[PDB]
Amino acid sequence: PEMVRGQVFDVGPRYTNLSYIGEGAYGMVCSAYDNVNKVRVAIKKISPFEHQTYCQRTLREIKILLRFRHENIIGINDIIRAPTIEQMKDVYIVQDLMETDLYKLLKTQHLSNDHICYFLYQILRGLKYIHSANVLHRDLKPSNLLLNTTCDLKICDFGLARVADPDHDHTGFLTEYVATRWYRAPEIMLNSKGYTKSIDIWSVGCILAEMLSNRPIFPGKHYLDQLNHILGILGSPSQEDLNCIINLKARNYLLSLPHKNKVPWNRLFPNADSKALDLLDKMLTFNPHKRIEVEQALAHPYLEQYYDPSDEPIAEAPFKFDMELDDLPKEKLKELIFEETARFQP
């Protein structure tokens, strides 16, 4: 079995000529030549079977990605693992090789308005499909958006995804949250579990702002600082938007703050297209009930060059986790991953 930086990276004879790319959320990632399709591919190594949380997220990613089929969502091409549960230690997930991600691109490259518009269209096109399946991505951010050499964009990492559950979205003030801090909607810190589609639109709004300036719009350094970044640009919420927050600890926190005025978008982004800033405003709305939905966002004048609902497909059915993955033991989740990956065995 081949090794990479002194570690087993055991992808059978189908995949050869490994080149270390780097580490990701799950573990080691290499490119390799796929001797069947005659193209280089990306392979990530996962070792999740001791920890219930890595198990849960790995199973979530696999079940979703195998069920989804969309041009702006990364697919799984192949999964490599041992033939029996007893011998299964690692799982290798094979995907299309992509030149870069939007995180790396934003660190190194100025984007033309045309590139911003095209990227945003593709993000929303993919998001339309995910939401149509009643799924929330819940961790949209530049590093989860992959690009190829021709700027085709694919959303990746469904490890934190959930089935939407708006009726159970309410929580108390300062409730801990898992998803990446700088892309968290204000309501996460106030009264939301992130179980509604509006959570993902906020993240997309944050990504659009980051494309406009190459800098994160709300780089909070800790849980509550994230809310204070957001309010520093949006300004103080209105009476009406405050009244929608029934929880007294959250309400009274907001009432305790000094009055902050809105920073106009055209002063933060003096080079931006005015239609881009109109759409940005609508995605970065404080009140999640007033926030634009994915289909409205696609229909916004900024995206007129691309908008075509007949070419923005939806999922054939809503997605469902058959068992509640949250309280399954470690051995049961390994068996589930074994079963979910069976279709790739010879």
Ligand SMILES: *CCC(=O)Nc1cnc2onc(C)c2c1
């Ligand atoms: C979702 C994050 C991710 O998969 N990152 C990534 C990095 N480098 C890559 O090269 N090919 C692919 C498919 C990727 C993904």
